Amino acid sequence: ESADLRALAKHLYDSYIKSFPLTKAKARAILTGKTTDKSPFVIYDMNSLMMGEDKIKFKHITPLQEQSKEVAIRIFQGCQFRSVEAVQEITEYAKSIPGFVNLDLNDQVTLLKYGVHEIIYTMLASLMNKDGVLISEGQGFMTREFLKSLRKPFGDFMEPKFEFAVKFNALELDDSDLAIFIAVIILSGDRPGLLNVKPIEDIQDNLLQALELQLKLNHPESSQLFAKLLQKMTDLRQIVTEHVQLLQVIKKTETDMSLHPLLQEIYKDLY
């Protein structure tokens, strides 16, 4: 029935609202110009990053990293820091997808281990336009041009994310669309090392129906939006592997030692 599916959508949308403070609708308002006053600090070069570093830390010692370092490395350390933060919120949201917490604990951990990245890059798209990305819970805004100009390995780092966001943001999805999408990702029965594949696919199967009904109702004028959205999941799988490859060059060719015990061991045997 339709009402069951719609009830599952409403249910997901409210968890997602509990789990993620900066939503797409809020982020989009900020990126445009809703009630222009609390404007984010715009970082567009090195000087304005240093000037900004002391306006998201000059308050009271809470940045995404301290100093005594090269700027291209510090930006990258701040991003790994935020990712660990975002893994916690994704885990919290997962627990509220019906059926998830009744899976075998190891399969829970595996699902999260490979889902988290695709979700991070999906949701990061809500903070981006073609020119930059909202940072620090929407406090800052770092321009795509500035990220591009960092040195050889750090420059080409966030570009692929921006290439994705633009094509994905053109689907015009909202938070209620994304909440299901995100849940269809977590319950991917094709992750390596999964013990019980059948029950996961039973869940995804019921989320797919929910997604499909959601898109058909919320976006009737968009022929085959469901299909296009499932195809975007190849693009995500792609950006993850390509990010994974770039990440396995950073720890390989660099001088900075300071990586999070969580990601560095969760990146282990990962595509």
Next chain:
Amino acid sequence: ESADLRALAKHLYDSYIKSFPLTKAKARAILTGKTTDKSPFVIYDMNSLMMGEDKIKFKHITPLQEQSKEVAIRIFQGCQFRSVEAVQEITEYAKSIPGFVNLDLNDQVTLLKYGVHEIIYTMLASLMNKDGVLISEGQGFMTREFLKSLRKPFGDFMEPKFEFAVKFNALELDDSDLAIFIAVIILSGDRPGLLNVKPIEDIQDNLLQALELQLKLNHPESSQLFAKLLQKMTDLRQIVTEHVQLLQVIKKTETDMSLHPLLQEIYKDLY
């Protein structure tokens, strides 16, 4: 509110199950006999020790050298290596404590630096009785009388931990209880060198509330269990200073030792 507090307990218990392979329930299964996979090998003297290592026929050891040193020192190498894994386990668990990864980064490190030893002893109690301790994932069992008999410096290393364990275990706490108690330890605002005390105390306070309710509901006949458990926090703190004092003696009585890089940071200027 009592629902969030129960939600926090199940949350922490799951992260506990996920981070620590040898739980209290399992350890007490191996100690009890209520298991289905051979009783552990008892080590009580030099010959049973010899054999317990020489038990390499269908039973393995963890990646490093073999009999490289003296007996007393080879146990010392054994525990050291296990510490490093405990630390990694504890770190993994820490990142899942609501509000921990949002903390200033230096603060995070400080909390882990001082909290780890306390958690290592609390959880080492789970594998103890008055007679000895499970070693190497509970495949082995080394007697307290054995550990007492070692050469001067080394024979006083685990005796303090034993005395604590017998009283702690009398509290009859379970894994669901330990999970919140451990979180309370890590989020301590009196660790030297912290930069944002208040946000740490706020979390502890909420964890304190959680633990109280967990104890009331899980041990309703146990009068003042909460107080009795917080009191054990001073016993633990004494174990650590004691342990760190024994390290000093090892610098004077031993030749080349030198600790694992990770452990050496955690001990650095530690009281």
